[PDB]
């Protein structure tokens, strides 16, 4: 069983930055997962894709997003962090860490922001 | 005289057997097996009880279909490996069976574009593999840089988030995704820009060169290894949440530790639960379960318990570990139902009543389930001791079928074989290894083809009519060997390294007691070549 | 829906499962086992019957205990082992937890004495050793010279003239022996210069440095290689001369040869004996052998027989080959009383003069008998040669327990292994040798303690949750590797010698049947990475 | 007390066990195993029936008699060989005991005549060899040129049209070939110039230098090699075409594709036949096939079946592939009996009559029918495995006496093994190489001998009292060396590759359960020798 | 199963020559054989010696037909040839091939030569 | 099984001089026994200890015995002797030679020996 705890949610005015982080138990080992991610739910839409790491080296932004947001992983740590700038009204809502190896699946407990 | 020119006549009449290229699993499908435990001492254990079990587990229901992969090998010397972009599958690959000279790779963190023998950008046709198997049949534009096609198995099993490809690599988006209302919905990990969608694509076979007569929706996706692309279908309806897996024809049901213990003399694996029944009717609407466990229940019993045992209730119903449910129905035999009417004249909830009734049941019934888990131990510590010796042979005969297999660590990793009809193989007449003269070959060399009018491939004889596609099995050459190797529902001789004729299976002798021997064996007596 | 919610919710269950590690066993306990033997013919044999045996062996009543062994390691470059000599023990080691850096050894057959450093003597204190289990705990001065104390068990059998240590190591005095009144006649080997008993010895441990709150008497012995030491207590009062090895559920008789010979399914080994009945009344005072013989062929008689057959007189003894003595109640089915019943209409003096009845049970109870022989001959040759495939698995099947087990020679030598909780092992995050680059490990490392707050021990992942202290199997690193190991209930997935994550055993297919497999199987297609 | 003085001198009661010498088989006999297969499914067959079965096989009436080889070994360096002519084994050889120590041979095409020791022709005699059994004799003039003559076993089978050597080597020339009358038919292949008869020959035994008392006719034949002889006796006369190969005591039958599947738990072989039955009376004129099929159905009804079942009517028969006839007689249990009797109150004919009792059977029997094969499959794939591993152990333990084996490719060669005395073999006191330091051998060095006054062969302690002739098994000698092997009855304990004494079979404790176990191990502790 | 195709028969006058060839499926190469030869019936006989190739490397020969036919095989073609030279009436007859492995024995259909 | 066949008892007078010898079986090798030796009785006491070889480099002696009495052995002869010097009359009584080789023990039958 894999545990993934996530912190680094708040609220912030137009402009403003944060910075989300999911560390993960021994039993998944971030750097070594087959596809990374944050998804962020809204009122009126299911699970849209945000920022994710799709293979040991690669990385996908949504197009509202690319530029502004940056994805990380640290593998001593065992953690991986979402580095927000500039953050817009519109990225408000409810952003749920993803990590998945090989058939096995995990998700966090969602976090909110607000702007 | 005469049945001698029958018995000669029969002896003709060879079995049905036939050759198999079984090529190494990748780790796409893989299997457990049970481990011997701990067996329980007959002082333990409670309330003992026999009955009929059906055995259900999670149905994940599997969704097999067919996926292309495209890519791009570079050479330049300096080995690399890239995708084919969207517009050359559309607009050169489907369109005219062509790819591009050229290729973007990257070396030292740079892009650099390859080209095929330094030349300038050109169109390349695809010719198709030589090597490559009916079902699995992929082209090539080469035999720098090449262009590669290939048409592969792939899986995908509920919630139907991601799909593995034969070549054991994952594929993190839904079959089912795409950009139709019902669609857009489903699981991807990947960019917009790093999938698209084709309405109304007509595909081309890349060996015919016939254009289909029907129109598709096709899915394209990029990985940074190579491009996938698969038919778009809407998802498949709904079905049950549990499959029957198993038909217990005897149960030993136990209380241990404040737990049931069920087990068999079949079932090798001994199931553990509480000792409260779940809730079934609540969420098996529709009876998808109920309809199942009940008619099971009722066959086996009119099978066979029909005229010596009684039913103590209706069904029962047990969550336990793992993916399993059992369903349950304790029986008492008629010589046992008797001991219980004897005592009440001074129905179910009498069973664990009658504590001098109990303590007779709980040692008769506790030899019977020790005597079952010491077996059982014996049985898996031989299978599992053999199955590191021998994959292939104990994957095929647990399964009952031709199957590929690999030890990969501590689970089994499986694929099927491909059939080859004994007239397609000929066995070559040597072998000595021409270029390193103190080697010689372990086995035959031999050239087959898996269709009628295929062309020959060079292969190997393995064990059990098996045919490799890598002549690797080596050795010294030594002075006076005799072999007979197994081909084709007889033998084939081999003679100081070279081919000599082909054996019936009846002009060899076959052993069954010490008195065929004693006319037969002699004092053999080594001649010591020189 | 929901019920899946339930499943997943189960799937978080894990087995009980812990981790052993499972030292290399010295040769201090070694068992053997039964070899196939050549099988007679059902011509052979006269006057069968069927019967119920009890068989017992001498008893050699064990007597375990706790034994110190005190020893000074030189190096000078020229190794060397010394023994402690007695005033150190007492006056150093015992009083004050110290050794002198000071220590005597032999060269050139000429006496020397090496120091620490070639420093002056001076007093050293012990500290305990790392790698110790909790258990069998030592200290040492060190981590030149070194000096070493270690408690290790010891084990002495009947008739005490002997002990040997957990090392493997025999001592050729009694572990009663003593200047007390009934000990200084037991038996010893050396002289008395070699030989202290203390009286009113005072333990101090070499950890909390706890004095003991009461006196003991402490038996010291020299031994050119070490110092041993014991707590001397008076010899332990006799018992029974047999013991009661097996309780067989029913048993062949045939004289055969002129000697009968004893067999059944269960037992695995035959019993040859004489044709006459040992006279044990007259050496079974107090009916130790006669008491459990008639209780146990009444019980099993009872048990099951009681209802069918009917026993022909009073329980036989006979004595076999080996240190066994046979208990043996011949039996007549009900059906074969009758026989004798009606051909006596023209009882245990009848069962062997009717010839025209034995004739027929000859053949009957023969076709039995040599059936059984040969089935056993067929387990015991798998059963031998898995052995020497996997001796710790198959030793730990036959005891039902996990053991270590080495294989030296045609004798296997076993000892107890230690378990360790599954949450104080650690799994390192690669398999690559580091100093090394073409190397890597077989299967993985891990960092694991055996109590929860002790230092953490360096190893190697084992088969089966074994826990090995010798990082040492090895493999050249070969490209597109992917592992599963089991690891405590679950597994562990390596790919390209890394670490990656941990499975439950839910996660991995269970395989059943064909069909299972034909809806998830796969052509396998090889990738060839570069 | 004194029951233990009566184990104690029963303890020195070693069982009659021997030592055997195997050589290596030369593939003279070579002998198959069976495959498993991927058998049918329950659903699967019509018509299943259940009854009492003969099977019968080819007879081949093997011809086992005595051949001498005579030939030349010359080593100019140059290696060759060469046969001994006529002349010299009649005038020389038999007339005196020596050959002439010229050898003709061929180099480069050319004749040459080798010398021993380049000295003049002359008459050299004949001594025994040293390491010969008595059984397989043999003599030579040296320890260049050397005569050689040796007495080895032959075989013949039907027709007699060639026989095998022990060496492994054919010879196309029928054992009952010669001048005389009746015999200038028989088969040869070899020119007349090849082969010649001697009437009136008397024989010289090589060792006792005895003269034979009676006349002989000597057959003489010169192959390329060496030149063999054997003694003409006129042709056994003829025998029956078929012989009794299995009396299956139960076996069913189903009619599947067209053809007749007959199956049985014992016979690990599925027959397979057509659906017409073979018309053998009109070719076993005498009832060779027809009285003993008919008296073993009946002997095997009688044993069992009489009271519990009814024949269906008169035996029937069947030729299946490879050498079978099959002589079967269904059968109906009285249980059954009843629905066709009740069926007709509305006898051969009804059996497949009756549909509805008929689907019943069909998946009654079909139960049991795939139960056997699926566990025949299990036993088949450990067995065949096991196999590979030990072949000496499987073959005789398949055979039932100690046999010589080896694997020869995927079929097994096999031979006789020679009995030696337990009294006759020496154990050698060090397993150390005198010349090689770094290395020791792996199992004990021996010395014994044939007979009780023969002299002293130096060989190799194999597994379970096998003695090899070649001192080739070694090891890198090691530190802590401790070993126990299996040798007459008991044991040999050998320590840091140094011999130090024999133990009985029962010093050694025997394993049953934990509890015994429990008692006696110990945490083994290594103590890392210097 | 082997099989022995023979060929090359029929009717020539004294003095005259000829040639038989035998060749054998891919189930029994002739070249590894243990003995390869050629039998001859006549109406008062059974079948005689003719000529055989008894070992890899020995040919073996009738007294009446020695220096004067020859035997011969060839591994390419799995064939093998009878040449025979300086035809007799005496040699008329029905001529068959044989071929055996080591216990395994194949016999042709006949083939008629008169002269 | 091992056999120890004991030999060189007698008597002499105070002053004298004995060689006692036990010689085994080849089943049991003395050299590489554990613990080897001869044990004296009198009529007044069990077994005592007069000289052993307790490791095989290893040797020890009875207190009125040390520097008077020497045991040795050949392991060509797979014998072991007690070469006795300067009897006295104390030294009457039944010697007993023993040997074991890890955990087999073995006697055997005393020989006498007066002063
Ligand atoms: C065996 O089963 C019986 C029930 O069939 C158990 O008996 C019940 O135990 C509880 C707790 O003591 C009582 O409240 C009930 O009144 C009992 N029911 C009956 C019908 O007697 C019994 O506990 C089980 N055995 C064990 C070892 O737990
Ligand atoms: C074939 O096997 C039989 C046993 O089934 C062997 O029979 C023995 O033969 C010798 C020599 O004739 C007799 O002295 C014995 O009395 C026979 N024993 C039995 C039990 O009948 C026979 O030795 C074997 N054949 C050969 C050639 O050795
Ligand atoms: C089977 O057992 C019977 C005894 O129950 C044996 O018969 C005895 O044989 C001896 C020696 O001939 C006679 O002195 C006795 O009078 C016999 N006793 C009876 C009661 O008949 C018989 O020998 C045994 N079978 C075999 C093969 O030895
Ligand atoms: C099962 O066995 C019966 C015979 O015992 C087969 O029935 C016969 O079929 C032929 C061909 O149609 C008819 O000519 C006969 O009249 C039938 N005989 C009887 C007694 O009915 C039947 O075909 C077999 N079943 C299968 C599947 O082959």
Redesign the interface.
């Known amino acids: 069983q894999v545990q993934l705890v996530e912190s680094g949610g708040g609220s912030v005015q137009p402009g403003g930055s944060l910075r989300l982080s999911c560390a993960a138990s021994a039993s998944g080992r971030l750097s070594m997962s087959?596809?990374l991610?944050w998804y962020r739910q809204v009122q009126g839409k299911?699970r849209e894709?945000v920022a994710?790491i799709?293979?040991r080296?690669?990385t996908?932004?949504?197009?509202s997003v690319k530029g502004r947001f940056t994805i990380s992983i640290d593998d001593a740590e065992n953690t991986m962090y979402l580095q927000m700038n500039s953050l817009k009204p519109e990225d408000t809502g409810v952003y749920y860490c993803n990590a998945?190896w090989?058939?096995m699946?995990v998700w966090g407990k969602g976090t909110r922001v607000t702007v | 005289?005469?049945?001698?020119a029958?018995?000669r006549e029969?002896?003709?009449?060879?079995?049905d057997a036939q050759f198999y290229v079984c090529?190494?699993?990748?780790?796409?499908?893989?299997?457990?097996?049970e481990?011997?435990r701990?067996?329980p001492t007959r002082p333990e254990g409670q309330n003992y009880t026999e009955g009929i079990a059906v055995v259900f587990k999670?149905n994940i229901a599997?969704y097999?279909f067919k996926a292309t992969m495209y890519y791009k090998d570079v050479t330049v010397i300096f080995?690399?490996?890239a995708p084919v972009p969207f517009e050359e599958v559309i607009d050169k690959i489907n369109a005219k069976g062509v790819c591009r000279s050229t290729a973007k790779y990257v070396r030292n963190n740079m892009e650099t574009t390859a080209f095929h023998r330094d030349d300038h950008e050109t169109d390349m046709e695809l010719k198709p593999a030589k090597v490559a198997?009916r079902?699995?049949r992929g082209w090539h534009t080469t035999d720098t840089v090449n262009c590669i096609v290939?048409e592969?198995?792939?899986?995908s099993?509920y919630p139907y988030?991601?799909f593995?490809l034969?070549?054991?690599?994952?594929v993190?988006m839904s079959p089912f995704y795409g950009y139709r209302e019902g669609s857009h919905?489903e699981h991807?990990?990947?960019?917009?820009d790093?999938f698209k969608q084709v309405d109304g694509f007509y595909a081309r076979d890349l060996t015919t060169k016939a254009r289909a007569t029907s129109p598709t929706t096709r899915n394209l996706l990029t990985?940074?290894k190579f491009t996938v692309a698969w038919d778009w279908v809407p998802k498949r309806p709904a079905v049950c949440?549990?499959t029957k897996?198993?038909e217990v024809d005897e149960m030993l049901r136990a209380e241990y530790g404040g737990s049931f213990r069920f087990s068999s003399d079949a079932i090798s694996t001994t199931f553990t639960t509480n000792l409260t029944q779940?809730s079934l009717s609540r969420?098996?609407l529709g009876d998808c379960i109920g309809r199942d466990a009940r008619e099971a229940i009722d066959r086996m019993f009119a099978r066979k318990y029909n005229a010596t045992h009684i039913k103590v209730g209706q069904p029962q119903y047990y969550?336990?570990?793992?993916?399993f449910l059992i369903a349950y129905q304790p029986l008492l035999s008629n010589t046992l139902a008797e001991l219980y009417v004897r005592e009440y004249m001074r129905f179910a909830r009498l069973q664990f009543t009658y504590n001098h009734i109990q303590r007779h049941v709980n040692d008769m019934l506790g030899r019977i389930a020790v005597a079952w888990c010491?077996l059982q131990?014996?049985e898996l510590?031989?299978?599992?001791?053999?199955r590191?010796?021998?994959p292939n042979?104990?994957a095929?005969?647990?399964?009952?079928?031709?199957?590929?297999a690999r030890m990969?660590?501590?689970?089994m990793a499986?694929?099927?074989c491909?059939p080859v009809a004994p007239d397609n193989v000929?066995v070559q007449?040597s072998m000595r290894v021409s270029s390193r003269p103190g080697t010689c070959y372990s086995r035959p060399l031999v050239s087959f083809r898996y269709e009628d009018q295929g062309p020959l491939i060079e292969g190997q004889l393995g064990?059990?009519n098996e045919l490799r596609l890598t002549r690797d099995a080596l050795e010294p050459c030594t002075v006076g060997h005799?072999?007979?190797?197994?081909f084709g529902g007889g033998?084939v001789?081999?003679?100081e390294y070279?081919?000599?004729?082909?054996?019936?299976?009846?002009?060899?002798?076959?052993?069954?007691?010490?008195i065929d021997?004693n006319?037969?064996?002699?004092?053999?007596?080594?001649?010591v070549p020189?």
């Not at chain 2, 005289?1 to 001698?4: F, G, V």
């Not at chain 2, 029969?10 to 079995?15: C, D, T």
């Not at chain 2, 969550?319 to 993916?323: D, F, K, R, S, V």
Request: net charge negative; with cysteine.
């Open positions: 087959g596809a991610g299911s894709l994710t799709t293979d080296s690669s996908n932004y949504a197009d998945r090989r058939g699946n | 005289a005469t049945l001698r029958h018995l029969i002896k003709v009449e060879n079995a090529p190494p699993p990748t780790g796409a499908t893989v299997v457990q097996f481990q011997p701990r067996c999670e599997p097999k080995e690399d490996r198997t079902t699995s290939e592969v198995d792939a899986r099993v988030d991601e593995v034969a070549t054991g690599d994952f993190y919905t991807t990990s990947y960019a917009a790093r990985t940074p949440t549990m897996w198993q779940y969420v098996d969550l336990a570990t793992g993916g010491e131990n014996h510590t031989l299978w599992n001791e053999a590191k010796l021998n042979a104990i095929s005969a647990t399964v009952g079928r031709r199957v590929s990969l660590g501590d689970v499986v694929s099927t491909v000929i007449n064990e059990n005799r072999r007979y190797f197994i033998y001789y081999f003679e070279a081919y000599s004729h082909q054996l019936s299976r009846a002009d060899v002798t076959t052993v069954s007691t010490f021997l006319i037969t064996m002699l004092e053999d007596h080594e001649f020189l």
